[PDB]
Amino acid sequence: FGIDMNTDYTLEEVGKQFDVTRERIRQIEAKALRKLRHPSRSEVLRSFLDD
Amino acid sequence: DPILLRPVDDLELTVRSANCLKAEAIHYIGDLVQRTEVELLKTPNLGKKSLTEIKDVLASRGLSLGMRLENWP
DNA sequence: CACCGTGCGTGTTGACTATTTTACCTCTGGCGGTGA
DNA sequence: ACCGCCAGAGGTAAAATAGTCAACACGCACGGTG
């Protein structure tokens, strides 16, 4: 996403540094997202969701 | 209690423990707490580690076993 | 306590579809040459 | 005052790239049995 950095690196370069072939790094990213998604870890981030 | 009627998903349990609960089809924590250690061990594919985790997570929020509820829901 | 039999998380292709840019026609403004 | 000419701005093709959807080894790790 580009948090604390200067570019939204695509999966290719992220795999270069983390050694892989996209699908695994895609795998690592999705777990994190579903994780930060459950309550008990996303109440204040939810507040920031204008409603 | 408001917390009990929340599904087990929010309880933040392991994949194997979640599958064991799904096999037991336990929707609410209020129903789960009524049971006891031996009854939980009666569940297949569940060992001492899973029961220990369940006890620890219940104790983290102050929940335990043995409390009998009535008219729930 | 110790040993062996599955379960399951952890790393790996192949085929398919959805952006994204780039280039090719077409409208439609502006513009300047030329004229007692 | 007019009339032929020029360039900036769109709709549609097409190539390139990125994201999306189901199998095989392999090494811990849990459970049965002694």
TrEMBL record, chain A:
It is found in: Cytoplasm. Residues 1-38 are annotated as: Sigma-70 factor domain-4. Residues 10-36 form the RNA polymerase sigma-70 domain. Residues 11-30 bind DNA. Signal peptide: none annotated. Mg(2+) binds at residues 43, 46. Transmembrane segments: none annotated. It comes from the Bacteria. Belongs to the sigma-70 factor family. RpoD/SigA subfamily. Interacts transiently with the RNA polymerase catalytic core. Sigma factors are initiation factors that promote the attachment of RNA polymerase to specific initiation sites and are then released. This sigma factor is the primary sigma factor during exponential growth. This is RNA polymerase sigma factor RpoD. The gene is rpoD. The chain holds residues 563 to 613 of 613 of the full protein.
